[PDB]
Amino acid sequence: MKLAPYILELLTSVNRTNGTADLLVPLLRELAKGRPVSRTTLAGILDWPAERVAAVLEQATSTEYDKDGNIIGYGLTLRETSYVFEIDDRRLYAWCALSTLIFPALIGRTARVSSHCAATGAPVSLTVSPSEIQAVEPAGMAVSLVLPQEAADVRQSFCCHVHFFASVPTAEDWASKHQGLEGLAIVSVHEAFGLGQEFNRHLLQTMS
């Protein structure tokens, strides 16, 4: 299907201010180590003042902090979700199915992804590298997409509707009872991975 609207709105939804893309990739790489990330650590990596880091994060209202005020969640998170995202010996989580397909390229590591079908509860899993997916189980795994909203919190307007499913027919059956959602579509996990590659390619072309 035509994916340009999804790419555009996701980029827009993500791109709220300058420096967001330049902040996003190092933050993801830090979170991937499996521990909370301090703003000062980010500042050192970026060679930014801490106030600049704070300003960018302030506009990302979905951002999760722990009791120490350190960053524990931004697309990738230490707080449990339905989407398990493992790198090496560290179990992380992701906010949505598409997230798990996009992050490995941005952090430059292969991830073991697992979840459950949103319609049947069946376990689903796959291996996601920066360049390809492997070990897709079950092989016909599907993903639901909706059109991201620009101003809304990306987590509640997009992520909460973007799931894995055991198969395309199972997902389309589920989708028939989810009317009203703007841009709701069912794609194979392969088409969703391609969507993520296009997203990443555009996102990375905007970094400093």
Q: Which residues bind Cu ion (CB under 5 A)?
A: 95-96, 99, 159
d(CA 132, CA 101): 9
- For the bound state, the minimum distance from the C-beta of residue 13 to Br ion, rounded and expressed in Å, comes to 17
Give the span between the Cα atoms of 111 and 104, in whole angstroms: 6
Task: Give me the DSSP letters along 24-73.
Answer: HHHHHHHHTTTS-B-HHHHHHHHT--HHHHHHHHHT-TT-EE-TTS-EEE
Which residue, 4 or 151, is less far from Br ion as judged by CB?
A: 4
Nearest approach, Cβ of residue 148 and Cu ion (Å): 9
Residue 4 as a binder of Br ion (CB under 5 A): the answer is yes
Nearer to Br ion (CB atom), residue 2 or residue 67 = 2
Is the Cβ of residue 6 or residue 74 nearer to Br ion in the bound state? Answer: 6
d(CA 91, CA 170): 28
The residue (of 2 and 177) whose beta carbon lies closer to Br ion is: 2
User: Does the footprint of Br ion cover residue 2 (CB under 5 A)?
Assistant: yes
Q: What are phi and psi of 92, to 5 degrees?
A: -110, 180
Residue 144: CB minimum distance to Cu ion, A: 12
